[PDB]
């Protein structure tokens, strides 16, 4: 079975995020998505155990 997320981001936002706050944040979006996938798996393992 699969699990998958979309980033859906623009251009100008990153240009300004970098110029203004020092962050491109494409990497951050990547981080968030990947993070969320791992968090979800952690729970599936735990939740399936509690279920079973």
């Amino acid at each position: 079975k699969s699990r998958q997320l979309k980033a859906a981001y623009s251009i100008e936002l990153a240009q300004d995020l970098r110029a203004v706050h020092g962050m491109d944040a494409d990497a951050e979006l990547s981080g968030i998505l990947a993070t969320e996938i791992m968090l979800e798996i952690n729970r599936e393992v735990v939740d399936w155990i509690n279920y079973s």
């Binding site: 699990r3 997320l5 998505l33």
Partner: peptide, 24 residues
């Protein structure tokens, strides 16, 4: 998700009628 999505989604691979949801 059911594996039938595996072929459908590789073929999106972004925009589609059966989209992946979004985070930001």
């Amino acid at each position: 998700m059911a594996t039938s999505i595996a072929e459908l989604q590789e073929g999106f691979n972004g925009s589609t009628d059966n989209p992946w949801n979004e985070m930001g």
